[PDB]
Amino acid sequence: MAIVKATDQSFSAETSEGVVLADFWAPWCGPCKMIAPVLEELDQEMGDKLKIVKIDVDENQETAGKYGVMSIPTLLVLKDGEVVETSVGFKPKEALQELVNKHL
């Protein structure tokens, strides 16, 4: 499964492996639950080239602060361990595929 669970301790190691799309969220979130099945569709559609890295902002304020994340769901596209793009809020799988594609 392409989807992984990380913290500030592991985030950089996980995001080093190619294009990775991190999901700054928290289980207390509402809108994040809408995009979760879209990330499962992304496992099913991009998991050959993509990794998806969920990170719980309620325990990872430092990593959130690293990019000024102040709302969720927030999406950080990293490539080879550094941020390459950002997006905020819900997006459909096609728009997310394009957001990945522009850095593949």
Residue 66 contacts residue 36 (beta carbons within 8 Å): no
Identify the H or E element spanning 35: helix 31-46
Residues 65/56, Cβ–Cβ less than 8 Å: no
Residue with the two structure tokens 């602060």: 65
Domain CATH number, residue 25: 3.40.30.10
Range of the domain at 99: 1-104
Give the list of residues 6+ apart from residue 28 with CB closer than 8 angstroms, or none.
58
Determine the Cα–Cα distance for residues 90 and 33; give it in Å rounded to an integer.
Answer: 10
d(C-alpha 85, C-alpha 83), whole Å: 6
Marked catalytic residue, from 6, 29, 55, 76: 29
Task: List the catalytic residue out of 6, 19, 32, 75.
Answer: 32
Pull the structure tokens for residue 70. Answer: 């102040």
CA atoms within a 13 Å half-sphere pointing along the CA-CB vector of 99: 22
**How many independent structural domains does the chain possess?**
1
Q: Where are the beta strands (DSSP E) in 1-104?
A: 3-6, 19-25, 51-56, 74-79, 82-88
Answer yes or no: 71 catalytic.
Answer: no
Token pair belonging to 91: 């997006």
